[PDB]
């Protein structure tokens, strides 16, 4: 049923009144938890990645009007990055998030672009792909995928089963461009 199918995303798309200082609190808390879990799980993570694409708000607080939407997007990105860290990757290289129009001074939903980049063995990378696809609390659609190999990856000896030979077995770099769907009031 479509009602049960969209049940989890409608509840998670509900906005909550938030102040810019509360948003900074959430951002720093999520960043600290992510750095702790990455040091625990042996996942190297740059600072631009650890800021979850909100590095522009590390010092400058966001606008009052964009606080709720930015908080929702931060929740979604944090959940996605934690699902990815649960997959056993080896490095988070980049988490880029273009600024929404509400940040710079009515459709039934709003897309939010995001570009993540990670690096790891083929198994963990495929698990991360499945995690991006299969999240039930936030709807992330895969708009583009880039895959790069390293200088000494041996070719195979002579959807998820199609791009597997296109990845090195030991380490592969993967950059995914996604659109988070935030459901607004339909009418």
């Amino acid at each position: 049923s479509l009602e049960t199918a969209y049940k989890p995303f409608l509840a998670s798309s509900a906005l909550v009144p938030t102040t810019p200082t509360a948003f900074q609190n959430e951002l720093k808390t999520f960043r600290d938890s992510l750095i702790s879990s990455c040091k625990k799980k042996n996942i190297l993570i740059t600072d631009t990645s650890s800021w979850l694409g909100f590095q522009v708000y590390s010092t400058q607080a966001p606008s009052v009007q964009a606080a709720s939407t930015l908080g929702f997007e931060l929740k979604a990105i944090n959940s996605l990055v934690n699902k990815l860290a649960e997959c056993g990757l080896s490095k988070f290289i980049k988490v880029y998030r273009p600024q929404l129009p509400i940040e710079t001074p009515q459709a039934p939903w709003t897309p939010m672009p995001l570009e993540i980049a990670f690096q790891g063995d083929r198994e963990s990378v495929l698990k991360a792909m499945n995690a991006i696809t299969g999240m039930q609390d936030y709807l992330f659609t895969v708009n583009s995928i880039r895959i790069r190999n390293e200088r000494m990856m041996p070719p195979p000896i002579a959807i998820q089963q199609v791009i597997k030979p296109y990845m090195g077995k030991e380490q592969v770099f993967v950059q995914v461009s996604l659109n988070l769907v935030h459901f607004n009031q339909p009418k």
Copy 2:
């Protein structure tokens, strides 16, 4: 060790004596056959793509010393592009081939040959083309990078650009 693993690809890497004019003839024949097959199979193909990345030899013949190597590379690229055309894609956008060092008049266990292909089509034909690149038994194409785009941002054409390294096994 390396022979047993890559055994099927070894036979096609043997070079054959070739003249620059014979290479140009072979190139023009492959280009005509490819354009004919694309017009029949309703697959749009640009002029730069039809030359299979050898457009620099459309008028000027190649060097004598690089003729055999260019013939091998042309055979491999032609087989790959025909395998792709058999998949029912909708467009061949680019087939770019950087010049090999043997071409410019200026002993490794193998020689890599770069190649950049780009095609466009529905998801089914794109997956068929990916499997065709994967499953080639006559020439070893190694995937150096692959990018996939859906054009119109979601929320049915799909663009795929693959950077490959053809492996030439020498004596």
